[PDB]
Ligand SMILES: O=C(O)c1ccc[n+]([C@@H]2O[C@H](COP(=O)([O-])O)[C@@H](O)[C@H]2O)c1
């Protein structure tokens with residue numbers, strides 16, 4: 268069974284925290300590759316001006332085009348939302364029976380796991396990987412592999428606020444992506 | 457009074473943690489510049505496999521060129537050995553009495569300020585800026601400015617360890633600095 272890591276999120280926008288995490292785990296547990304899985308736009312969000320899935324995908328290709336081992340997984344975008352990880356992993360496990368999936372999660376998300384949908388049944392479908400700062404320890408009743416990393420506390424939401432507020436975004440996300448964001452007016456048009 | 461930031465460290469090697477913090481604080485508190493204050497090495501350690509003050513400055517030069525607002529301060533390097541921040545700031549407070557420096561530190565260090573040599577006298581020479589990830593609160597007995605930043609937990613010590621064990625260093629520090637390290641064979645000596 269080949270080992271593949273998957274990092275899910277809105278990727279609105281994708282950033283160095285996503286890349287760093289992927290790289291870190293890729294090497295730490297020696298994975299064949301890491302797939303970036305964008306989730307579907309959940310209901311009741313089109314009430315303001317929201318980034319289309321199309322742009323999130325373009326920014327995601329910009330961010331990962333330089334890595335052969337980083338791919339985009341459209342499984343969740345191929346269906347309606349919200350995107351429950353359990354439903355998703357159930358389809359990916361059926362599509363790739365020879366793969367052991369490692370679902371990568373940021374240390375700050377670990378506590379929220381008991382609230383995920385069918386998380387216990389989801390535990391049979393994959394192996395969770397919680398990422399944490401060197402020396403810190405993730406707490407959870409669930410079996411989870413930990414990978415210590417120079418964790419980068421950047422997120423898509425903070426980047427959205429920064430752009431809306433004409434704040435700095437230096438070092439926060441790939442250059443080819445900030446270009447795409449300004450050229451197209453995202454979060455600050 | 458012009459506001460100036462100071463970031464101290466071995467810068468052995470300088471990395472993205474340093475640059476991210478500088479830019480974040482430079483903006484958050486509207487500073488005119490940020491100065492990188494490298495530590496002087498103990499006199500008796502200039503062989504085995506320890507980087508020279510020489511190799512450190514060139515690396516730091518690489519990491520800061522393209523930033524007009526980032527410059528190197530050599531005040532501590534003008535002494536035969538390591539000297540306390542209090543002694544260094546007291547000297548700078550005098551050479552530039554028209555400046556109110558902002559000594560910047562990682563949030564995880566704030567806890568130990570009480571053990572700093574002359575911490576008390578020092579607190580009246582500079583204004584401390586504790587850096588913190590969003591959410592995390594900075595617990596301290598002192599009247600310190602806190603700036604919320606998407607913290608990057610990379611350190612020189614973690615990097616020196618990565619190169620020694622041929623591990624990945626991606627996204628952790630500038631390419632110009634990485635090129636220099638591998639070519640001159642530092643750490644991986
Ligand atoms: O399955 C769930 O009920 C569930 C609830 C919250 C978050 N997640 C997972 O968390 C991943 C990244 O975090 P987030 O907050 O963008 O959803 C996302 O891709 C989902 O797979 C999953």
Ligand SMILES: [Mg+2]
Pocket residue numbers: 435483
């Ligand atoms: Mg700016």
Ligand SMILES: [Mg+2]
Pocket residue numbers: 294624
């Ligand atoms: Mg590698």
